Amino acid sequence: LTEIEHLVQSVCKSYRETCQLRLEDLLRQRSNIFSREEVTGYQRKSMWEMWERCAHHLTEAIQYVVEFAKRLSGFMELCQNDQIVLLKAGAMEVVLVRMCRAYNADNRTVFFEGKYGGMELFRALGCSELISSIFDFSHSLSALHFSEDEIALYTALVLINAHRPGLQEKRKVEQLQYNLELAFHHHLHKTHRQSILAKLPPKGKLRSLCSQHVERLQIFQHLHPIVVQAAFPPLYKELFS
Numbered sequence: 001l002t003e004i005e006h007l008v009q010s011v012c013k014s015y016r017e018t019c020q021l022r023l024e025d026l027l028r029q030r031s032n033i034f035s036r037e038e039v040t041g042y043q044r045k046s047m048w049e050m051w052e053r054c055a056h057h058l059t060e061a062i063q064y065v066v067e068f069a070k071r072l073s074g075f076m077e078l079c080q081n082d083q084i085v086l087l088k089a090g091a092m093e094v095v096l097v098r099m100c101r102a103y104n105a106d107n108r109t110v111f112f113e114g115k116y117g118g119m120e121l122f123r124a125l126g127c128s129e130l131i132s133s134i135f136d137f138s139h140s141l142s143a144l145h146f147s148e149d150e151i152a153l154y155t156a157l158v159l160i161n162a163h164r165p166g167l168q169e170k171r172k173v174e175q176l177q178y179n180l181e182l183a184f185h186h187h188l189h190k191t192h193r194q195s196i197l198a199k200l201p202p203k204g205k206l207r208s209l210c211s212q213h214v215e216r217l218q219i220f221q222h223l224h225p226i227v228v229q230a231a232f233p234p235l236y237k238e239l240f241s
């Protein structure tokens with residue numbers, strides 16, 4: 001019918017094509033949990049091996065988010081400066097939101113390298129407080145039981161934010177943002193899910209968590225540079241040095 005029903009469909013399709021891990025796989029695998037022996041195996045790995053592994057997974061996760069963004073109506077018609085401003089500010093925020101699908105609140109585990117494990121899996125990295133904060137964020141989000149379409153629409157909005165500093169064509173970003181806001185709000189009304197609005201994270205929370213996360217990734221990358229399977233030169237250039 002309207003532009004807006006079509007926009008819901010195209011955002012959800014973009015998400016489906018880029019969600020990386022299927023929800024029904026993630027749910028089915030919840031009973032597949034790392035054994036005590038497997039956990040010890042991970043805890044004994046070098047900090048630097050765990051860093052290599054996690055950095056590679058995080059890179060790949062960011063690439064799926066970039067592909068998601070590229071498929072959002074109007075995103076590719078933004079100027080390249082603005083595309084990069086949006087991705088730099090938002091792509092890791094989206095990854096952190098996407099985690100909640102892979103997180104099981106019943107036992108505080110995340111799907112990692114084919115089974116579920118708790119935060120203690122990552123002991124060798126020596127960032128227990130940061131990791132705990134990330135797990136807690138996913139735990140808060142878990143309680144919403146976000147649907148796949150809610151995740152799609154919400155994460156589109158994490159990216160398409162006209163308030164990011166440094167945008168050159170702010171009105172163009174505003175147009176996209178308003179349409180996405182309408183799509184999300186329409187969809188929540190249609191599905192009797194508007195109750196989630198008051199339960200979503202305060203925006204400051206996601207921003208500060210992400211900033212802390214990226215800061216730690218930068219520290220590790222300075223200490224122990226990784227090989228990146230780089231697909232997006234303008235974005236790579238902004239994050240790596």
Ligand SMILES: O=C(O)c1ccc(/N=C/c2c(-c3c(Cl)cccc3C(F)(F)F)noc2-c2cc[nH]c2)cc1
Pocket residue numbers: 055056058059060062063087088089090091092214215217218221226228229230231232233235236239240
């Ligand atoms: O394919 C490409 O070209 C490409 C380009 C950039 C990429 N990600 C960059 C990262 C990383 C990060 C990661 Cl994921 C791992 C190790 C070290 C880092 C470091 F912090 F060092 F950058 N952290 O946040 C972002 C990010 C991206 C957008 N907003 C935030 C990923 C793939």
Ligand SMILES: CC(C)CCC[C@](C)(O)[C@H]1CC[C@H]2[C@@H]3CC=C4C[C@@H](O)CC[C@]4(C)[C@H]3CC[C@@]21C
Pocket residue numbers: 019020021051054057058061095096098099102110111112122125127130131134213216217220
């Ligand atoms: C600060 C870093 C050095 C260590 C970060 C440790 C985390 C929080 O312990 C990371 C390590 C690997 C990360 C995961 C890598 C890949 C994915 C798939 C993506 O679709 C959702 C997020 C998800 C599931 C990540 C969530 C957070 C993880 C699970």
